[PDB]
Design a protein around this nucleic acid. Structure first.
Ligand SMILES: [Mg+2]
Ligand SMILES: [Mg+2]
Ligand SMILES: [Zn+2]
Ligand SMILES: [Zn+2]
Ligand SMILES: [Zn+2]
Lengths: 95, 336, 31, 277, 56, 214, 86, 205, 372, 98
DNA sequence: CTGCTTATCGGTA
DNA sequence: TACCGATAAGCAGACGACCCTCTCGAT
RNA sequence: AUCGAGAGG
């Protein structure tokens, strides 16, 4: 069943943060991508058995992070890129 | 006039009436139509418009402004509607179905905006109310930093009544045989009659009690006393005079110092904002202001003793209690 | 409505730009 | 007990849903807003009931508020880029003298207010006092013929579409003006848009009929193109066969367009839950 | 759903018959009735989700 | 009877509202000087015939030595009323030099009908001197007297530096007030200058809100 | 810029535990209890990993620290021992 | 006036039959014959009022009030005879122009409350006040529409999930906007635990 | 759920929206993208170095995702690029690219007003990249001439000729003077020479977004996981609506290779530029008044990345703010006087369906082992 | 509703031919100022001219319809006070009894 | 029903 | 007394439009 | 999977 925005607002009101994530991560779509530490995109080619990661051309081989987001998000970001917009995903707090 | 003539006639054993009397379903209007008459029918403010030229139905002449022609149903649902009456009522009810099908569309859009606009407003760990940027919206949530669930409509009875009727209630005058606390009420009754160290404090309170009465009448210009405030006191009082079982024919054991300097020290620690600088403490004072006008009006020297004869323990509990019940009514940082 | 479309309207739709440059359409028969 | 009045297409029964529309060839005056310069408009949805589907609409606009300095009366013509004052139109038709112009509009000698209301037009008029430049104001011999066709083909296509009737159209246009000011003077009420006697229902016939036009005219021009390629019998009946089906099948009343907003199922899939259903 | 009270936690009582059942007095806040409304139900899956349900 | 009496009365009340305004800025005026009765206005500022000359009203003002405690750099403020309906850039050259020479800081112009777009261009042309153009219709009643208006209290550059740490805000993160706001005009606000408004609440008697100025 | 922090004293924050604070505490513990982790109270005869954390709450024995945030970025720490629970 | 027929007669001081008509237009619809313009019909109504008695009680004093069909505050309060300390407009937008921002806040509330309470329903002040306050605090009157709040400079991802879904993201791509991710909506999208009640704080050992 | 990863787990904290530099676009990818044909090469159902594959994802659930492998339930889908020979505009930026062209001089390419103008002094100092641009443009649309020099007589750069009164006409920009139509290639070189200090003034950022990227030099090609394939068919054949429009771009981009390096006419290449523009415009939006779209092997009109994200049913407001989710249930309610307030009668068949992950612990084994 | 139908459609011009044969003056040959007590006549929203004394013209029209001589489906509205006579033969007029 | 172009109105050049 | 340039009422454009849910029909 | 029609609260 659709857990729509109109319901989400009711979970926010209540203050239940964890449930509201669980219900939008474990149930429905969750996903694991690899982000580059220099450029904040999904360029990284995940060779997940030879440990070799590499953000090619971009010349990175070390700075790479595993993150947990919904697939519908990843999808949204790829679509935004294909439309020629870079949505940078960074990991550390300050600028 | 017809309806409230049927309402008068309906026996106490009349089922319809008994559901109204309970409030389970039904109201006056429902009875009026069912037995008396259904009344005038309307579409967009005005009674039934001329749809045909200069008439409402082709069963009528032109230029007819009488009741039945323009949409009055003289009949009850129990008697039955007439052909025209029927059609007329049809027009009227159909209007209800229409706007409802458009209210719910308009509303559902209102709400989605409302929700989308205020969204990220939450009270942070300091009672400051702000958004995602940190733009203050309120400095204390709901101008007083109190969660709305814990709040009840209590009468602020410093506002009401004659100046005569107010002195009669709150004024204690130790250097006045007539306007003193009869040794009936207090243990130290007559052994206080006179005195000047304890009329400085008794005066002290009575002065604030009058400073309050004007300050309130200034805010709630209406004369309306009953106002949503934290911690129900009328109850904590009852819950003392039955919890400690105290007769209304034998005296107390409280000093005048015990009363007056208690209330003032309770006031001292009804915390809402907890910072230790200049500004913060003035907000703190301001956020309680209204609550305290109540506190003071009910924990008044004469009141405590003449109205609801407390005892040293029971009074010290009533304070211990209030402080605790108040501390709970604060909004929790997090609340969205 | 369907009987007007069969008995009178159909013949009419069949006769207006019917004629060409010749080859022209005449009476219309329903089975 | 089955009463019929449905079609059977691929086993499933289909109903043709009566379509409702405002009626053609009737004349209506409409008070217009408050921030708009035109205060009254008189409209007619002129179309011929037997032959084609060409919706030419005429507007008799009454520029200017009450109190506003001099109320002109212009008119809207199909294909024409702008708006023409009515007195040029009357002269574009046949009538040239003012006062015979008013004879087509105002059907009484006494009604001074009426006439008073028209003064502002005559004034807009005597920039042109003749047949030839009345039509010329429509934008040499090329463009008079552009106007002389338009006032016969496209202007008030009912009454007639030929040539030999010019006072037929004059009187009517006059009657539209009569009707517009009759209400601007608040001597008659505005026209009621929800009056059921001026709406029509388009039934199973007239629905098919306008769809049949389109399909038959499609097949009539497929024949032309098979005749051209002869340069010196094999007709694609599949068109009229399966074109009437698609429309009766879906609800997209109109073949392979769908950009026609008729999408709303015309042709719904009966409904046999109960007999009274 | 236009409340916090439109969406609340409950204790499960497994029963026979294929209708969801609730107590009459939990009517007003959902704005239900029994003329044939349909109701939804979501299940927590991690320990805290259960805490965060039953405590808030 | 006139009609010149209604033009006087509206000008009398216009005066009132200028006094209250000026003391509220932080300046020195008695409570006797405010409540100048109707009789006493015509027999002080009017001329031979019985019509009011306004160049006659143009008084000055200086701060209560109480306002020099909080605001050191506040000093010379000057009011001037105006006779002309048509006020262009030619009388604006007349009044800028006036202030330029006397060494004021703040000037109040009180025009009766309109200010031309040319006259406005010759206002921020002298630093740090300032001038505020007030219409008279805008001044017949004191807006701060009305029920809905709570009293705003201009605070110091050092009292702000205090608020801006006791709530750890950044200037941005206040609720803002308009430079053109009817009240913020009446008290003279510049960018950065934060008022403080003491509203009466049905939830707690008083509540203090703050607004930085746009 | 870390580590700014806030000193043990000069705390302004409700010493009381917010409903949200503890709901997440009990949760946090109820998670690690249900994963057969060591328990710091005498199980008087309950087997529900979340009632066990409710009993560990009652007797102040949950070794976690609530870290509260203030808008600028500063933060106050509160042990589960110090916070009153009412 | 005491005549049976009332007449005005007016002459000027070629083309003059035309320009006597441009005066007749101006004469009818530009001649303020008295009172304030914009204002239509005005009705005297006998409003109730509770107010202090000498003795102290609150007793009913019946008060004649005026009710209008149009708005020009700038020019009705500046009138002799009326109390210009209580005059009210149901237009909170004119109140904002005339009596300042903070006076508007209260009329905007006075309004919102008057919707809710007229129908029966009571709602607690913290709520309507907060709306009111959110609208009022940007400086002017920020609407609850795509033009109002969804404009003010909040981290792009948030404003996306409202109305101008793509153009937000678009000009966000061009101005190189930075997103804090302190907003609810931003963390629903990223599928993380949103800084809300339960996630407002942090847990450590 | 998936697999071990030696890269550490972290939460997102900042999101920095920017723009794609052609230099990145073709350095970021693994694609060549020569052929507008999908799979078959004379019936051969492999994949082919044309569209979706060369060093990209898979379809027949084959491990092969170019060495990366891990099936299609792990591979994020690797981006591509397509080399347009001639610069084309960027649909949603038409409104802004024009606003800069009404703000920056022609021929020389520099700001129209410096710190010399007394009103432009009040614009350059203001905070917020958005309202700064909102002040400048309203004060540069009036000014035409490049100017000799502004009064003190102080001197700077200057080229002379007037700035056009630039209008929007569908996909192109026309200009008057005192008519020449402004090519895309032209504005490439204009924004390429803009001064480093000239970005920051009008709402940009040195490295993240630069006005030469506002216009499209090199187009990113979205991987299969953004536009999948088969339905009730198999083996033939069909596919999603973004694969059609990319072919429509490719076929009109390889159409300008056979008109520049072959028999090259003069005034008939523009009849092929306005369609290569139109396809890269429509593939990113088609709701602007003029012309919608055709099939081209389906119906009417077309999707387009924009109307994939537009709210309600869209990727954001309808797949992110509100997801369809698991562990749920729905049935008719009915009321029960003999139940407790905080309770809820679940039907058994539902109780038999939903579930809770319960980890075994000495406390529960006896109840659990029984349960299994 | 129960008793309602639709107008299927008839032919206008054998009504046209009857009117002109019963004293309807055609529109071309019309003089407004000279024919003031004249009732204008439309058929299907087309002005075919004017008719003096429609009083008897209507009774003749009625009698033919109520015999079946003129299709019973054709509706004929005389307005006394607007002085008009519109005979309608459109397709899709809804109608009932009675 | 908030963007921009046209119809409008002034002093100094 | 001629042209610059400042500018508000006048006039044409537009991205929103309830929530969740169940059947069945055609390319 | 896209579009569409009917219906439930
Ligand atoms: Mg129901
Ligand atoms: Mg019901
Ligand atoms: Zn990289
Ligand atoms: Zn891969
Ligand atoms: Zn230049």
């Amino acid at each position: 069943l659709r857990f729509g925005e109109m319901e989400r607002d009711c979970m926010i009101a209540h203050g239940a943060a964890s449930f509201l994530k669980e219900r939008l991560m474990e149930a429905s779509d969750a996903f694991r991508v690899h982000i580059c530490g220099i450029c904040g995109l999904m360029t990284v080619i995940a060779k997940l058995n030879h440990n070799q990661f590499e953000c090619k051309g971009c010349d990175n081989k070390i700075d790479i992070y595993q993150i947990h987001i919904p697939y519908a998000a990843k999808l949204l970001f790829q679509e935004l890129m294909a439309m020629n917009i870079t949505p940078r995903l960074y990991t550390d707090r300050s600028r | 006039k017809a309806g409230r003539l049927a309402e008068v006639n309906l026996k106490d054993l009349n089922n319809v009436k008994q559901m109204v009397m309970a409030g389970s379903k039904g109201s006056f209007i429902n009875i009026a139509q069912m037995s008396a008459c259904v009344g005038q029918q309307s579409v967009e403010g005005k009674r039934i418009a001329f749809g045909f030229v200069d008439r409402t139905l082709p069963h009528f002449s032109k230029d007819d402004y009488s009741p039945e022609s323009k949409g009055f149903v003289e009949n009850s649902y129990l008697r039955g509607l007439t052909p025209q009456e029927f059609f007329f009522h049809a027009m009227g009810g159909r209007e209800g179905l229409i706007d409802t099908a458009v209210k719910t569309a308009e509303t559902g859009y209102i709400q989605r905006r409302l929700v989308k606009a205020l969204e990220d407003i939450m009270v942070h760990y300091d009672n400051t109310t702000r958004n995602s940027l940190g733009n203050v919206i309120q400095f204390i949530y709901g101008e007083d930093g109190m969660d709305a669930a814990h709040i009840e409509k209590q009468s602020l009875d410093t506002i009401g009544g004659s100046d005569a009727a107010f002195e009669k209630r709150y004024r204690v005058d130790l250097l006045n045989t007539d306007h003193t606390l009869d040794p009936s009420l207090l243990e130290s009754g007559s052994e206080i009659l006179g005195d000047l160290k304890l009329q400085v404090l008794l005066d002290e309170e009575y002065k604030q009690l009058v400073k309050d009465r004007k300050f309130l009448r200034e805010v709630f210009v209406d004369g309306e006393a009953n106002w949503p405030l934290p911690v129900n006191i009328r109850r904590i009082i009852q819950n003392a005079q039955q919890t400690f079982h105290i007769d209304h024919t034998k005296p107390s054991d409280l000093t005048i110092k015990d009363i007056v300097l208690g209330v003032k020290d309770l006031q001292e620690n009804l915390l809402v904002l907890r910072g230790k600088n200049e500004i913060i403490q003035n907000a703190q004072r301001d956020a309680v202001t209204l609550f305290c006008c109540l506190l003071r009006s009910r924990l008044a020297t004469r009141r405590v003793l003449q109205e609801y004869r407390l005892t040293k323990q029971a009074f010290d509990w009533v304070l211990s209690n209030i402080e605790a019940q108040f501390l709970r009514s604060v909004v929790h940082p997090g609340e969205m | 409505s369907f009987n007007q479309f069969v008995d009178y309207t159909l013949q009419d739709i069949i006769c207006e730009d019917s004629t060409l440059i010749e080859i022209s359409f005449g009476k219309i028969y329903v089975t | 007990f089955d009463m019929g009045g449905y079609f059977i297409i691929n086993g499933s029964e289909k109903v043709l849903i009566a379509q409702e529309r405002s009626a053609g060839n009737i004349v209506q005056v409409f008070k217009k807003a408050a921030p708009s310069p035109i205060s009254h408009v008189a409209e007619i949805r002129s179309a011929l009931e037997k032959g084609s589907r060409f919706i030419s609409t005429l507007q008799v606009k009454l520029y200017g508020r009450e109190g506003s300095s001099a109320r002109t009366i212009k008119a809207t013509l199909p294909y024409i880029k702008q708006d023409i004052p009515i007195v040029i139109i009357f002269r574009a038709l046949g009538i040239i003298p003012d006062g015979e112009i008013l004879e087509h509009i105002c059907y009484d000698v006494n009604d001074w207010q009426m006439l008073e209301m028209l003064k502002p037009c005559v004034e807009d008029g005597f920039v042109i006092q003749d047949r030839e430049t009345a039509l010329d104001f429509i934008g040499k011999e090329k463009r008079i013929q552009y106007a002389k066709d338009i006032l016969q083909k496209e202007f008030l296509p009912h009454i007639t579409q030929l040539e030999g009737f010019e006072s037929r159209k004059a009187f009517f246009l006059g009657y539209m003006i009569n009707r517009l000011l009759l209400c601007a003077l608040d001597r008659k009420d505005q026209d009621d848009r929800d009056h059921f006697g001026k709406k029509r229902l388009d039934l199973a016939g007239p629905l098919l009929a306008q769809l049949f036009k389109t399909l038959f005219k499609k097949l009539t021009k497929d024949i032309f193109r098979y005749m051209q390629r002869t340069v010196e019998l094999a007709i694609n009946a599949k068109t009229i066969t399966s074109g009437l089906k698609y429309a009766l099948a879906t609800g997209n009343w109109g073949e392979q367009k769908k950009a026609m907003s008729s999408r709303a199922g015309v042709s719904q899939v009966l409904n046999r839950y109960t007999y009274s259903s | 759903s236009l409340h916090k009270m439109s969406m609340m936690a409950h204790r499960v009582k497994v029963i026979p018959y294929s209708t969801f059942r609730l107590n009459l007095s939990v009517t007003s806040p959902y704005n239900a009735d029994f003329d044939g409304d349909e109701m939804n139900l979501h299940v927590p899956q991690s320990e805290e989700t259960r805490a965060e349900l039953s405590q808030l | 009877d006139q009609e010149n009496e209604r033009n006087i009365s509206r000008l009398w009340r216009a005066f009132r509202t200028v006094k209250e305004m000026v003391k509220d800025r932080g300046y020195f005026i008695t409570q006797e000087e405010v409540e100048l009765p109707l009789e006493d206005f015509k027999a002080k500022y009017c001329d031979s015939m019985g019509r009011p000359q306004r160049k006659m009203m143009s008084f000055q003002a200086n701060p209560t030595e109480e306002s020099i405690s909080k605001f050191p750099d506040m000093g010379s403020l000057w009011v001037e009323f105006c006779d002309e309906p048509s006020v262009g850039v030619k009388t604006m050259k007349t009044f800028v030099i006036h202030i330029q020479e006397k060494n004021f800081q703040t000037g109040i112009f009180v025009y009766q009908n309109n200010i031309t777009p040319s006259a406005m261009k010759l206002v921020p042309s002298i630093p740090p001197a300032t001038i505020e153009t007030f219409n008279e219709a805008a001044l017949v009643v004191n807006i701060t007297h009305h029920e809905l208006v709570p009293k705003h209290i201009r605070l110091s550059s050092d009292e702000k530096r205090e608020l801006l740490k006791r709530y750890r805000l950044k200037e941005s993160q206040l609720p803002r007030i308009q430079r053109a706001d009817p009240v913020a005009l009446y008290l003279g606000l510049k960018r950065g200058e934060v008022v403080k408004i003491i509203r009466k609440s049905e939830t707690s008697g008083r509540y203090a809100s703050y607004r930085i100025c746009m | 810029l870390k580590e700014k922090a806030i000193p043990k004293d000069q705390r302004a924050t409700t010493p009381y535990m917010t409903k949200y604070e503890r709901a997440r505490i009990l949760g946090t513990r109820a998670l690690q209890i249900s994963m057969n982790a060591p328990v710091f109270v005498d199980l008087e005869g309950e087997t529900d990993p979340l009632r066990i954390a409710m009993k560990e709450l009652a007797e102040k024995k949950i070794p976690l620290v609530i870290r509260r945030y203030l808008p600028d970025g500063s933060f106050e720490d509160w042990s589960v021992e110090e916070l009153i629970v009412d | 006036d005491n005549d049976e027929k009332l007449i005005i007669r007016c002459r000027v001081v070629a083309e003059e039959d035309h320009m006597l008509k441009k005066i007749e237009n101006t004469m009818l619809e530009n001649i303020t014959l008295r009172g304030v313009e914009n204002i239509e019909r005005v009705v005297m109504m006998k409003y109730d009022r509770k107010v202090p008695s000498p003795t102290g009680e609150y007793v009913k004093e019946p008060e004649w009030v005026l009710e209008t069909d149009g708005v020009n505050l700038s020019e009705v309060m500046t009138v002799p005879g009326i109390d210009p300390t209580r005059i009210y407009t149901n237009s909170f937008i004119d109140i904002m122009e005339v009596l300042g921002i903070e006076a508007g806040r209260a009329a905007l509330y006075k309004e919102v409350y008057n919707v809710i309470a007229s129908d029966g329903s009571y709602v607690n002040y913290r709520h309507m006040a907060l709306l009111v306050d959110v609208m009022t605090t940007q400086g002017g009157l920020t609407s609850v529409t795509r033009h109002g709040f969804n404009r003010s400079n909040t981290g792009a991802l948030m404003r996306c999930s409202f109305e101008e879904t793509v153009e937000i993201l678009f000009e966000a791509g061009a101005s190189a906007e930075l997103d804090d991710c302190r907003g609810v909506s931003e963390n629903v999208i990223l599928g993380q635990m949103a800084p809300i009640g339960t996630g407002a704080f942090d847990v450590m050992i | 759920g998936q697999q071990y990863s030696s890269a550490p787990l972290r939460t997102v904290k900042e999101v920095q929206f920017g723009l794609f530099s052609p230099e990145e676009v073709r350095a970021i990818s693994v694609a060549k993208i020569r052929f507008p044909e999908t799979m078959d090469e004379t019936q051969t159902r492999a994949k082919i170095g044309g569209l979706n594959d060369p060093r990209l994802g898979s379809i027949d659930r084959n491990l092969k995702c170019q060495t990366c492998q891990e099936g299609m339930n792990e591979c994020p889908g690797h981006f591509g690029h397509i080399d347009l020979a001639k610069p084309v505009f960027h649909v949603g930026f038409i409104a802004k690219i024009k606003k800069v062209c009404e703000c920056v001089c022609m021929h020389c390419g520099k700001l129209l007003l410096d710190e010399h103008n007394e009103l432009m002094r009040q614009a350059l100092a203001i905070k917020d990249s958005k309202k700064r641009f909102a002040a400048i443009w309203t004060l540069c649309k009036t000014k035409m001439v490049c100017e000799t020099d502004v009064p003190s007589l102080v001197s700077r750069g200057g080229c002379g000729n007037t700035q056009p009164t630039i209008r929007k006409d569908g996909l192109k920009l026309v200009g008057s003077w005192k008519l020449r139509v402004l090519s895309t290639e032209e504005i490439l070189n204009i924004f390429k020479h803009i001064s480093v200090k000239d970005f920051t003034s009008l709402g940009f950022n040195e490295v993240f977004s630069r006005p030469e990227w506002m216009i499209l030099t090199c187009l990113p090609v979205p991987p299969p996981p953004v536009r999948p394939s088969i339905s009730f068919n198999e083996s033939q054949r069909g596919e999603d609506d973004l694969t059609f429009k990319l072919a429509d771009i490719l076929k009109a981009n390889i159409s300008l290779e056979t008109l520049e390096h072959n028999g090259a006419p003069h005034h008939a290449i523009e009849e092929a530029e306005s369609l290569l523009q139109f396809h890269v415009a429509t593939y990113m939006d088609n709701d602007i008044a003029g012309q919608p779209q055709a099939l081209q092997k389906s119906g009417r009109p077309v999707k387009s990345i924009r109307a994939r994200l537009k709210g309600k049913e869209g990727r954001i407001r309808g797949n992110l703010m509100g997801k369809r989710v698991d562990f749920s249930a729905r049935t008719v309610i009915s009321g029960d006087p003999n139940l407790e307030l905080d309770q809820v009668g679940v039907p058994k068949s539902i109780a038999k369906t939903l579930t809770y992950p319960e980890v075994v612990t000495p406390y529960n084994i006896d109840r659990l082992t029984q349960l299994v | 509703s129960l008793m309602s139908c639709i107008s299927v459609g008839t032919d206008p011009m054998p009504i046209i031919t009857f009117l002109s044969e019963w004293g309807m003056e055609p529109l071309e040959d019309y003089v407004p100022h000279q024919s003031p007590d004249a009732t204008r006549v439309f058929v299907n929203g087309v002005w075919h001219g004017v008719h003096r004394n429609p009083a008897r013209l209507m009774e003749t029209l009625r009698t033919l319809r109520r015999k079946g001589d003129i299709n019973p489906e054709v509706s004929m509205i005389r307005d006394i006070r607007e002085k008009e006579l519109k005979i309608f033969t459109d397709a899709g007029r809804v109608y009932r009894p009675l």
